[PDB]
Design a protein around this ligand. Structure first.
Ligand SMILES: Nc1ncnc2c1ncn2[C@@H]1O[C@H](COP(=O)(O)OP(=O)(O)O)[C@@H](O)[C@H]1O
Ligand SMILES: [Mg+2]
Lengths: 255, 96, 135, 272, 96
C-alpha cells in the first residue's frame, strides 16, 4: 500500500494519470464507484513496481496509448491558459512523468554560498535552452545586436527630424552590450566594436572576449537565444523612451 | 452446504439489485442506488405464536418476491452468500 | 538605504572583516595555542580554544567589514559540519588565500582565472592528501 | 457623431495615438453606439481587439468527462436546456425527475447550480459517458449574494427559473418548462459561454436596466466595476481590447490612454 | 406487468397531488405544499388475523379515495411509479 501522489485536486488528476498509464480504473468516490464492487477488469496492470522507504516507481505500465496521449494533451491544451509559473511547473512534472522523461541534475558544492550560485547558473542555462528552442539562436557577444545597426541605419535614411534622432539613439545603444563585454574583459569597447562592424561579409563575425580573438561567433559556439536578445532590447527601449518624456516628477519631500 | 431455519415469523430473503439503468435509461452510479427493498424468500419459519398459543402461518410462501422497509431486519452470510432475516412486520407486500 | 562600494575599496573592506575574525581565531591553533574568552549574555563567559565557537561570536560594526567576517565564519562552520574538527586550520587557510589573492587582484590579475587555478591547485593538493593517508 | 471616421478621430486625439483611435472605432462600429467596450491587460507585446458572443462567465466544467470535443477539451451543446439551482446539488433524488424529463427529450443539458457534488455529479458524468444524456455542470457564476443576483441574470437571458426558495420552487419539482434554453453552450476548463439565450426582451431589458439604476448610486470603485461587469455579460455586442506592452509601466499608461479615448467617445456621442 | 400483494391489512395507496391553486385561486409554491394525505387504494390485502383466527376484511375497497396521516407508512416505487404501503391504523377515512 502506498499513499496517493499529490494533494488537493492534483492527486485526483494524477491518480487518473496513473490510471491511463497502467490502464486500470480510478475508484473515484465521486464518479460513483464502490470499493466493494471493484473488479479485476478495472485494475491497473504493469510490468514492474519498485517501492522504497519513500519512493514508488511504476515500470511497464500496460495503459492504453490513447489514454496516455489524451491524458497528456489535456495538460498541454491547459498550460496555454496557466499563468503563475508555479502552476505551470506542477502541470509540467505530470506531463513529464506521463512522457516517461524526467531528468534531474543534483548540484554539488563545497559551501552553501558557492552552491547557491552554481545551482543558479544551471537554472539560467536551462531558461536559455528553453528560449533557444522556442525562438532560435543568434551569434553572441552582442554581435547580433551590432548587426542590427545596419538595419537601423537603413531606417534612418527614411526618417527625418527628431524621429531620425530617436533612431540614431538606438543605433548607438546597440553597441553597449558588445562594448561592455569587451570592456569587462580588459579591452577597448570602441576598438573591438569597430573591427566587428568592419568585416561585413559574414555577420557571424565577432569578438571572443574570453580568448581575445575575433572569430565566427556561431562556429565558435558563442551563441544566444534570439528570444533573450529581442526581449532585453524591447524592454530596455520601453522604459528608456518613457524616461526621455519626463518633464516633471512628484516625489516625497526629503525626510 | 447448510440450511437456514428462521424462527417465530422470521423469513429469510435474498435482496435483488436494481437494474443498472432506470426507466429513462439513466445508468445510475453505484453511489446513487441504495439497498434494495426487494428479494425472494428462501426460508419461511414457524408462524407467530399469538396470545392463545395459535401459530398464524406466514402469509408468504417459500419463494415469493417480497417488499420490505430495507432499513430493518438483521443481515448475515452463509457459505459465501448474504441474506436478510426479516420479521413479518418488516414484510410490506408481495410482487405478483 | 543601500551603499554601492566598488573595486579595491570594496575588497579592502571585506578583507578587513576577514582578518578581524581570522586573527581572533588563529590565536588558538596548535598545541601551544591559547584560549579566547567569549562574553555571554548572563552567566560567566565561555573560555574556548575552538575555532567556530569564537568565529561565530564575532560581529563587526561596519557593514562591509562584517560581510567579510561572515564569509569567513562560513568557512569555519561548514568545516565543523563536515568534520567537527579543523575549524581553525580552515580559517587560517582562508585568510592566507584571501590576502595573497587580493594582492594579485590589485596587481591586475583576472580573478576568474585565479579561481580556476586555485581550484586545480586544491584538487592536486587533495589528491596528495589521500595519497599519504594511512588507514 | 455619425460614422466610423468621426469616432476614430475623437479617439485618436483623446489618446494622442492613431492606432488607439482605430481599434476604438473598429470595436465601436461592430458593437453599435449602445454597445460595450472593455479594456483588458493582454499578455503579448501586442494589443488585440476581440468580440464576444453571449453571456459568459469565468467558470467551467466541474469534471472533464463533460467534454464534447477532445482536442479542444470543451463541451459544445446544441440547443441545450439550462437548469438553474441557487443552492448546492449533491442529492440525486431531487435531480432524477428532470434528468429523465430531459434525457427522454434527447437534448443537451447545462446545469448551473451553486455546485454539483457526490453521486449527483457522478450520475451526470456516468450518464454523459453511456450516451444516456449530454450534460455539463458549471459551478455558480459569481460568489455570495452577487451570484444569487447573477443567477437571476443567467435566468432572465436564457428564459428559465431560479431554483431557490424565493421563486418558490423545489429541485425535484422541476419541469422541462421551468428552465432555459440556448442555441449553443461552450464550456472550457474554466469558462462558460451560453450562446443565443432564449430569455425575453423585457426580462433582461429590466434585469440590466436595474443594474444600471443602482450603479448611478455606487461610488465604490469595487461595487462600480462589479455592476458594470454584470451589465456587460447581459449583452451580446461586447468588444474587448486587450492592451499589450513590454513593461508594466508602459502598459499601465497605454491601457490608460485607451480608457480616456473611450470616455471621450462616450461623451462625443452624448453631446456632440 | 408486476402486481402488488399487500399483507396483514396493509393497503397500497397512490398519493394525489393537491390542486395548483387553493380555494381562493392562490397558486402555492411547491415548497409550501406538503405531501398529500390522500390517494386511491390499488391493492387491499388479507384482513388482520384477529385473536381467534378471524381475518377482519379491510373497510376499504380496492379503489377508494383514502385519508391517512401522511407521516406514516413505508413508500416504494415499482416499474416507474411510487406508492405507499399503509396499515389499517394509518387509514383515517374515505372520501365519498
Ligand atoms: N604536539 C603537536 N605538534 C605539532 N602539531 C600539533 C601538535 N598537537 C596538535 N598539533 C596540530 O595542531 C593543528 C590544529 O590544532 P587545533 O588547535 O586543535 O586546531 P583546529 O581547530 O584547526 O583543529 C593540527 O594540524 C594538529 O595536528
Ligand atoms: Mg485627453
Amino acid at each position: 500500500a502506498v499513499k496517493a501522489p499529490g494533494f488537493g485536486d492534483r492527486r485526483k488528476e494524477m491518480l487518473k494519470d496513473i490510471a491511463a498509464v497502467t490502464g486500470g480504473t480510478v475508484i473515484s468516490e465521486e464518479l460513483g464507484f464502490k470499493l466493494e464492487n471493484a473488479t479485476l477488469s478495472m485494475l491497473g496492470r504493469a510490468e514492474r513496481v519498485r517501492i522504497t522507504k519513500d519512493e514508488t516507481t511504476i515500470v511497464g505500465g500496460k495503459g492504453k496509448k490513447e489514454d496516455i496521449e489524451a491524458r497528456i494533451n489535456g495538460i498541454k491544451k491547459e498550460l496555454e491558459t496557466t499563468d503563475s509559473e508555479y502552476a505551470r511547473e506542477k502541470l509540467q512534472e505530470r506531463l513529464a512523468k506521463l512522457a516517461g522523461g524526467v531528468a534531474v541534475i543534483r548540484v554539488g558544492a563545497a559551501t552553501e554560498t558557492e552552491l547557491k550560485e552554481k545551482k543558479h547558473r544551471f537554472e539560467d542555462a536551462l531558461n536559455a535552452t528553453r528560449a533557444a528552442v522556442e525562438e532560435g539562436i543568434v551569434p553572441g557577444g552582442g554581435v547580433t545586436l551590432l548587426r542590427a545597426i545596419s538595419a537601423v541605419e537603413e531606417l534612418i535614411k527614411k526618417l527625418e527630424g527628431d524621429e531620425a534622432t530617436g533612431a540614431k539613439i538606438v543605433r548607438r545603444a546597440l553597441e553597449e552590450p558588445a562594448r561592455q563585454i569587451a570592456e569587462n574583459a580588459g579591452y577597448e569597447g570602441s576598438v573591438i566594436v569597430q573591427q566587428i562592424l568592419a568585416e561585413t561579409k559574414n555577420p557571424r563575425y565577432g569578438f571572443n572576449a574570453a580568448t581575445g580573438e575575433f572569430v565566427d561567433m556561431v562556429e565558435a559556439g558563442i551563441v544566444d537565444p534570439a528570444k533573450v536578445t529581442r526581449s532585453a532590447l524591447q524592454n530596455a527601449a520601453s522604459i528608456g523612451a518613457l524616461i526621455l518624456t519626463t518633464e516633471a516628477v512628484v516625489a516625497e519631500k526629503p525626510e | 452446504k447448510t440450511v437456514i431455519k428462521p424462527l417465530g415469523d422470521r423469513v429469510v430473503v435474498k435482496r435483488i439489485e436494481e437494474e443498472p439503468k432506470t426507466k429513462g435509461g439513466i445508468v445510475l452510479p453505484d453511489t446513487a442506488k441504495e439497498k434494495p427493498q426487494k428479494g425472494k424468500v428462501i426460508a419461511v419459519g414457524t408462524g407467530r405464536v399469538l396470545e392463545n398459543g395459535q401459530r398464524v402461518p406466514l402469509e408468504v410462501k417459500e419463494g415469493d418476491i417480497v417488499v420490505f422497509a430495507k432499513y430493518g431486519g438483521t443481515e448475515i452470510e452463509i457459505d459465501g452468500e448474504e441474506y436478510v432475516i426479516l420479521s413479518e412486520r418488516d414484510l410490506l407486500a408481495v410482487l405478483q | 538605504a543601500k551603499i554601492l562600494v566598488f573595486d579595491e575599496a570594496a575588497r579592502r573592506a571585506l578583507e578587513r572583516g576577514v582578518n578581524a575574525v581570522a586573527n581572533a581565531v588563529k590565536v588558538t591553533l596548535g598545541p601551544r595555542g591559547r584560549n579566547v574568552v567569549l562574553e555571554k549574555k548572563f552567566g560567566s563567559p565561555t573560555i574556548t580554544k575552538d575555532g567556530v565557537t569564537v568565529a561565530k561570536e564575532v560581529e563587526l560594526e561596519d557593514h562591509l567589514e562584517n560581510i567579510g567576517a561572515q564569509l569567513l565564519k562560513e568557512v569555519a562552520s561548514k568545516t565543523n559540519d563536515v568534520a567537527g574538527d579543523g575549524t581553525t586550520t580552515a580559517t587560517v587557510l582562508a585568510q592566507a588565500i584571501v590576502r595573497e589573492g587580493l594582492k594579485n587582484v590589485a596587481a591586475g590579475a583576472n580573478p576568474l582565472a585565479l579561481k580556476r587555478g586555485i581550484e586545480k591547485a586544491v584538487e592536486a593538493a587533495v589528491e596528495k592528501i589521500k595519497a599519504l593517508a594511512i588507514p | 457623431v455619425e460614422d466610423r471616421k468621426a469616432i476614430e478621430e475623437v479617439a485618436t486625439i483623446s489618446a494622442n495615438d492613431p492606432e488607439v483611435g482605430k481599434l476604438i472605432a473598429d470595436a465601436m462600429e461592430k458593437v453599435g453606439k449602445e454597445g460595450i467596450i472593455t479594456v483588458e491587460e493582454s499578455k503579448s507585446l501586442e494589443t488585440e481587439l476581440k468580440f464576444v458572443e453571449g453571456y459568459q462567465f469565468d467558470k467551467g466544467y466541474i469534471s472533464p468527462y463533460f467534454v464534447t470535443n477532445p482536442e479542444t477539451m470543451e463541451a459544445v451543446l446544441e440547443d441545450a436546456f439550462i437548469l438553474i439551482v441557487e443552492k448546492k446539488v449533491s442529492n440525486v433524488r431531487e435531480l432524477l425527475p428532470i434528468l429523465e424529463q430531459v434525457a427522454q427529450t434527447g437534448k443537451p443539458l447545462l446545469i448551473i447550480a451553486e455546485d454539483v457534488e457526490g453521486e449527483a455529479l457522478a450520475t451526470l458524468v456516468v450518464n454523459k459517458l453511456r450516451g444516456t444524456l449530454s450534460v455539463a455542470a458549471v459551478k455558480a457564476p459569481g460568489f455570495g449574494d452577487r451570484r444569487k443576483e447573477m443567477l437571476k441574470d443567467i435566468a432572465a437571458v436564457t428564459g428559465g427559473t431560479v431554483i431557490s426558495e424565493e421563486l418558490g420552487f423545489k429541485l425535484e419539482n422541476a419541469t422541462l418548462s421551468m428552465l432555459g434554453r440556448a442555441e449553443r453552450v461552450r464550456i472550457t476548463k474554466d469558462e462558460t459561454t451560453i450562446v443565443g439565450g432564449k430569455g425575453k426582451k423585457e426580462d433582461i431589458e429590466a434585469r440590466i436596466n436595474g443594474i444600471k439604476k443602482e450603479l448611478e448610486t455606487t461610488d465604490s470603485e469595487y461595487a462600480r466595476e462589479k455592476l458594470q461587469e454584470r451589465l456587460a455579460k447581459l449583452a451580446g455586442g461586447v468588444a474587448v481590447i486587450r492592451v499589450g506592452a513590454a513593461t508594466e509601466t508602459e502598459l499601465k499608461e497605454k491601457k490608460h490612454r485607451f480608457e480616456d479615448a473611450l470616455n471621450a467617445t462616450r461623451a462625443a456621442v452624448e453631446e456632440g
